[PDB]
């Protein structure tokens, strides 16, 4: 029912004639726990405002994910520029074995049993982007059946 | 990278040298204070840091920090040294152990006594 | 020669003997040809405690293997019980 959680809040600076201008960026992630997950990156002069902006962004532009019984559909890799991510379905009771950002994104998405690792850069925004991309691309057996022109029973 | 290349010449493990080689993979070692002096810290710090250049039982001539406020050390003072650098004395890689052979425990300490060789007050 | 004897195993004050075929020269718990049973002298009631593979023992004896006195006693006990 739209569970949301803020991964990282980071202070960034701009320089002007006067001096430095600080502002805050908030990376949040929302999801319905049934497949839908979406991340948002808001910027404002103060943290709460930034978070609100991020939340609105995340709530819009969500994406559907094919989940098989609260777990992944197959082992999937994902990249986004520096962040290359691996995530593998695991037996019921394994829990989310996943990094920071990754854990958040998976949890809001609704995966209950995963084995993840973040290779490459572990920059939260890029890592979240990578995970969402991987989750999105991951197809289900009904999808493969549709593509190949067979029944799901012939493929298994 | 090419499998042939690897077969020809395999991958070298990165041999990491130790940062405390006078210990020689010993947890502590005994030595005699050749010389006891104070020295200036690095560029974000000001102090007169107490240090002793010590000849170890195994031949090495190292430099060792002397932690705690005040010490009863001088030349020909048998001490135990341990691992640990003073980040801000350049080239000092070893601490003296307060509360060992010639080295006394710190006077009037009530906290971290185990670290400074001080017995429990009444 | 080859002999059939107890090898002491377990804990202090709680011995458990493994019945082993072994060249007599070898140390008690050392090199052995075949392990042909066990014996548990502190075994409680409602526990087996002894078990000798009698066929193997017979085979080794036929081959010409001597038997420890304790092992002989164990064999006798097994025969009576069975």
């Amino acid at each position: 029912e739209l569970q949301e959680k803020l991964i990282a809040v980071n202070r960034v600076s701009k320089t002007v004639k006067g001096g430095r201008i600080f502002s805050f960026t908030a990376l949040t992630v929302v999801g319905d726990g049934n497949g839908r997950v979406g991340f948002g990156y808001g910027k404002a002069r103060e943290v709460p405002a930034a978070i609100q902006k991020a939340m609105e962004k995340a709530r819009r532009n969500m994406i559907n994910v094919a989940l098989n019984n609260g777990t992944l559909q197959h082992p999937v890799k994902g990249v986004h520029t520096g962040s290359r991510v691996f995530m593998q379905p695991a037996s019921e009771g394994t829990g989310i074995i996943a990094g920071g950002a990754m854990r958040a994104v998976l949890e809001v998405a609704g995966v209950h049993n995963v084995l993840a690792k973040a290779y490459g850069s572990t920059n939260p925004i890029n890592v979240v982007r990578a995970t969402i991309d991987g989750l999105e691309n991951m197809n289900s057996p009904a999808m493969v059946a549709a593509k190949r022109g067979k029944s799901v029973e012939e493929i298994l | 990278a090419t499998v042939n290349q690897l077969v020809r010449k395999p991958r070298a493990r990165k041999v990491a040298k130790s940062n405390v080689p006078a210990l020689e993979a010993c947890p502590q070692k005994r030595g005699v204070c050749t010389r006891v002096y104070t020295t200036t810290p690095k560029k974000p710090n000001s102090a007169l840091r107490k240090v002793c250049r010590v000849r170890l039982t195994n031949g090495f001539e190292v430099t060792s920090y002397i932690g705690g406020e005040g010490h009863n050390l001088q030349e020909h003072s048998v001490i135990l040294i341990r691992g640990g650098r003073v980040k801000d004395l350049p080239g000092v890689r070893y601490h003296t152990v307060r509360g060992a052979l010639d080295c006394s425990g710190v006077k009037d300490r009530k906290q971290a006594r185990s670290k400074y060789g001080v017995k429990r007050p009444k | 020669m080859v002999t059939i004897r107890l090898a002491r195993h377990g804990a202090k004050k709680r011995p458990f003997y493994q019945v082993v075929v072994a060249d007599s020269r070898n140390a008690r718990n050392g090199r052995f040809i075949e392990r042909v049973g066990f014996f548990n002298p502190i075994a409680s009631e409602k526990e087996e405690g002894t078990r000798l593979d009698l066929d193997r023992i017979a085979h080794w004896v036929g081959q010409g293997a001597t038997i420890s006195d304790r092992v002989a006693a164990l064999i006798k006990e097994v025969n009576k019980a069975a």
Binding site: - | V3, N4, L6, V7, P10 | -
Partner: protein
């Protein structure tokens, strides 16, 4: 049926004796590539029947010299 190995005759100079490479096409422990490995063997051959480059079948036997514990059983592909 007896255990026997085939190999190309790397040399045949020492009298009554030949050297027989027994190349085996093993897989590399780590990298998984298949590497050609070689096994030189001093083989006894009475009558000096073997030539160089000759394929030859050999069996193991009681040691006949310091280095020579194999005997030839039959020559094959003995062309020049």
């Amino acid at each position: 049926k007896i255990r026997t190995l085939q190999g190309r005759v790397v040399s045949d100079k020492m009298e009554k004796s030949i050297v027989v490479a027994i190349e085996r096409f093993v897989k590399h422990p780590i990298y998984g590539k298949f590497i050609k490995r070689t096994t030189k063997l001093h083989v006894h051959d009475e009558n000096n029947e073997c030539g160089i480059g000759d394929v030859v079948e050999i069996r193991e036997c009681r040691p006949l010299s310091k280095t020579k514990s194999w005997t030839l059983v039959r020559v094959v592909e003995k062309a020049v």
